[PDB]
């Protein structure tokens, strides 16, 4: 799944 973080997208 995608991770959301202060505006920004984290792929893992």
């Known amino acids: 799944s ?3 973080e ?3 997208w ?3």
Request: net charge positive.
């Open 6 to 8: 202060n505006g920004k």
């Open 10 to 12: 984290t792929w893992k």
């Open 2 to 4: 995608w991770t959301w």
